[PDB]
Design an enzyme around this catalytic site. Structure first.
Site, PDB file in Angstrom:
ATOM      1  N   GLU A  11      -4.634  -2.667  -6.384  1.00 37.46           N
ATOM      2  CA  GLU A  11      -3.858  -1.487  -5.986  1.00 37.46           C
ATOM      3  C   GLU A  11      -3.348  -1.551  -4.563  1.00 37.46           C
ATOM      4  OE1 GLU A  11      -2.857   0.730  -8.080  1.00 37.46           O
ATOM      5  OE2 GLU A  11      -4.296   0.596  -9.748  1.00 37.46           O
ATOM      6  N   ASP A  20       4.541   4.133  -6.844  1.00 38.17           N
ATOM      7  CA  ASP A  20       3.821   3.102  -7.565  1.00 38.17           C
ATOM      8  C   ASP A  20       4.781   2.299  -8.426  1.00 38.17           C
ATOM      9  OD1 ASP A  20       4.293   4.532  -9.954  1.00 38.17           O
ATOM     10  OD2 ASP A  20       2.224   5.091 -10.270  1.00 38.17           O
TER      11      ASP A  20
END
Length: 164
Positions: A11, A20
């Protein structure tokens, strides 16, 4: 390697609101703020999550606190889900990390739909599971990450994450 190191690799860490892979506002170590296209909505969610007026930026300690909460939520979600819990309980510790990773990325409901892959994993048919898991939007949209998680399920080792 452990689940925190694994998801920190997958991440990253960003202290300002970002989008994202799906275009959704996120902060920290993959903490999803909202699927709304409104940055103001994301900022409001952020302030609610952190408990102060952040104006879109947090500290590393705050990011790590959200991350602890999110990993805990992923594990709890698995343990409360009647389709996921038996498969998770059947797994060794390394493969449990692969499971948590998937639930962190796509949510409990989303993984629980991977019915055929879950069955193969419960049966310890690892190569078959690996092939099935790759037949997915997940693999096609985030192939490098999916390949790492799949290798983890296939082998039961951290080979895909060594060395970062």
């Amino acid at each position: 390697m452990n689940i925190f190191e694994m998801l920190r690799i997958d991440e990253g860490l960003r202290l300002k609101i970002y989008k994202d892979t799906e275009g959704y506002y996120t902060i920290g170590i993959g903490h999803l703020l909202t699927k709304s296209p409104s940055l103001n909505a994301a900022k409001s969610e952020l302030d609610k999550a952190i408990g102060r007026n952040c104006n879109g930026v947090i500290t590393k300690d705050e990011a790590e606190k959200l991350f602890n909460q999110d990993v805990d939520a992923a594990v709890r979600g698995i343990l409360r889900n009647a389709k996921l819990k038996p498969v998770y309980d059947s797994l060794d510790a390394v493969r449990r990390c692969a499971a948590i990773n998937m639930v962190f990325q796509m949510g409990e409901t989303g993984v629980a739909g991977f019915t055929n892959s879950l069955r193969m994993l419960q049966q310890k048919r690892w190569d078959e599971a690996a092939v099935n898991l790759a037949k997915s939007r997940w693999y096609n949209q985030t192939p490098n990450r999916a390949k790492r998680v799949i290798t983890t399920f296939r082998t039961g080792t951290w080979d895909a994450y060594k060395n970062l």
